[PDB]
Design a protein around this ligand. Structure first.
Ligand SMILES: [Zn+2]
Ligand SMILES: [Zn+2]
Lengths: 427, 125
């Protein structure tokens, strides 16, 4: 009840009801259950839900939005209009705006953008005028982000996050107590831990030695556990590497006996890593390691971690480059890319606010990639430079690629929501 | 039968497609030299074949049953007609693929491929 690891495929599914205006448990609805191989309808619902979660959220912030069918209908020029829709590039350079009621040709040639990383498939609030079946946009913006407190105020204490509890953990004065008492609680995040590289192993030793006098609550080691996924034989190389890691962890009894280890797999690791959510590394691959290090769990990607009253979502993906390669335009340089980036993820309330061809997702399981309600800590382990930002009450960090960031990693003290950094390059 | 396009013999570099159902001896020998193909390699290639096909399925085009028009948007549940969109890559055909692959695994001691297959099945009641 104090520390739970929730896999993507165990995330409680909720369906929004536009009528009762509430989120209902899957079995409490007439909505078909999810399967890996979905139906054409499922593929459509994927984006409908993405639109619906934003619509519902946006309708409460309050401006008068117009649907697209409303515009496509009109026989006259609609001077002013703000529409919530998804940007799609049907033809190169030709952009359109889509919503449940229809699609409309977009003219963004004179549009201005608020901060954020605007990409193909992002939902936006487009303000402008309409005439002759074309929507001329003056300004693009993102639907306003709704903080946890607000979501909780409207919907109650539904446990959207998942885990043992049947009610939100942010409403447990008991866990709040424990959370504030355990000031030494600490989570260490690393990414691209290439176990096949000698230097990576040497730096993990230094980390274990340095943490022995005060072993962290948990080490979250993120994916791409091999610097070389070409291989003389991939699966066995990974199994061998884990043997070495287990040996090193066992050589530091203080860490071995106190610290929990969580392994979040990357897109290049064995398994179906290129479609999300992806399952954990195969048990045949990890059995041996788990026998020597019983306090470990190999989870999905993304995955959710619940610690006392705090929600932590972890996602390993080279997301920033995907977003950049699919941008409508470059954001203004008066704000750093990670700040634009985080605004996007939270405003979209989704980890992969991109097209399926860019971020393949099992249609029926898209809801598992949601970032709403906003969590306490969002970890996007990316090969992109490390960073720590704070948007809408949510701490968002990226420890970066361990082997390529001078062996940098991030530390999170839950007691007072503080984030710290370390770098072992010089050793 | 089931063929793997151009498998390479690590011993002599001889390249040729390999029919897994027709070229067994439980092993697969190179045609040129008679070195046995690394089962481990075959297993992994089969796995990748499942991935590539699982990917093809996830990104497949959708067609209208009334007009043969490919879906060009994301949200519409129906077509400009009132026609329904249908899979261009079928679930049934994928399952069959899994049956074949599941057999080869059962017969050649490919525990890893069995695992992936099993998961692939468990997530589709
Ligand atoms: Zn040969
Ligand atoms: Zn049609």
């Amino acid at each position: 009840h104090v520390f739970n690891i929730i896999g993507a495929f165990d995330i409680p599914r909720f369906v929004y009801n536009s009528e009762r205006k509430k989120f209902l448990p899957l079995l409490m609805t007439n909505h078909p259950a999810p399967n890996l191989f979905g139906t054409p309808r499922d593929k459509a619902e994927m984006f409908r839900e993405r639109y619906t979660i934003l619509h519902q959220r946006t309708h409460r912030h309050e401006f008068q939005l117009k649907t697209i069918e409303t515009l496509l209908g009109s026989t006259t020029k609609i001077g002013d209009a703000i529409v919530l829709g998804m940007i799609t590039q049907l033809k190169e350079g030709k952009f359109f705006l889509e919503d449940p009621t229809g699609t409309v040709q977009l003219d963004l040639s004179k549009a201005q953008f608020h901060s954020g990383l605007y990409t193909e498939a992002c939902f936006v609030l487009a303000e402008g005028w309409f005439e002759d079946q074309v929507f001329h946009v003056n300004a693009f913006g993102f639907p306003p982000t709704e903080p946890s407190s607000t979501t909780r105020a409207y919907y109650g204490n539904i446990n959207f996050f998942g885990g043992p509890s049947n009610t939100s953990v942010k409403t447990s004065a008991k866990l709040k107590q424990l959370e504030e008492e355990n000031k030494d609680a600490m989570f260490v995040f690393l990414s691209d831990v290439w176990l096949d590289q000698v230097e990576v192993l040497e730096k993990l030793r230094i980390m274990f030695a340095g943490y022995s006098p005060a072993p962290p609550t948990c080490f979250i080691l993120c994916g791409n556990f091999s610097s070389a996924p070409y291989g003389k034989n991939q699966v066995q190389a990974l199994k061998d590497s884990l043997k070495t890691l287990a040996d090193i962890i066992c050589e530091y009894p203080d860490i071995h006996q106190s610290s929990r280890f969580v392994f979040v797999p990357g897109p290049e690791d064995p398994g179906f890593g290129s479609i999300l959510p992806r399952p954990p590394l195969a048990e045949s691959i990890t059995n041996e390691f788990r026998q020597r290090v019983p306090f470990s769990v190999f989870t999905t990607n993304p995955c959710r971690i619940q610690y006392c009253t705090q929600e932590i979502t972890v996602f390993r993906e080279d997301l920033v480059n995907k977003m950049c390669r699919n941008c409508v335009r470059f954001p203004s340089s008066n704000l750093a890319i990670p700040n634009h980036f985080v605004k996007t993820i939270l405003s979209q309330g989704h980890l992969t606010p991109l097209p399926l061809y860019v971020c393949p997702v099992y249609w029926a399981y898209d809801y598992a990639l949601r970032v709403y309600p906003v969590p306490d800590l969002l970890v996007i382990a990316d090969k992109y430079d490390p960073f720590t930002t704070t948007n809408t009450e949510c701490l968002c960090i990226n420890p970066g690629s361990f082997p390529r960031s001078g062996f940098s990693f991030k530390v999170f003290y839950p007691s007072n929501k503080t984030v710290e950094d370390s770098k072992l390059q010089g050793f | 039968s089931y063929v793997l396009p151009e498998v390479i013999c690590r011993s002599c570099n001889f390249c040729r497609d390999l029919d897994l159902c027709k070229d067994s001896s439980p092993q697969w020998l190179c045609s040129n030299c008679q070195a046995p193909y690394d089962s481990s390699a075959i297993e992994m290639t089969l796995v990748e074949v499942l991935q590539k096909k699982l990917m093809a399925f996830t990104l497949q085009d959708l067609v209208c049953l009334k007009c043969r028009g490919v879906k060009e948007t994301s949200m519409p549940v129906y077509c400009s007609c009132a026609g329904d969109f249908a899979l261009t890559i079928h679930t049934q055909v994928f399952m069959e693929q899994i049956g074949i692959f599941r057999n080869i695994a059962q017969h050649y001691g490919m525990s890893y491929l069995l695992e992936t297959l099993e998961w692939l099945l468990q997530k589709n009641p």
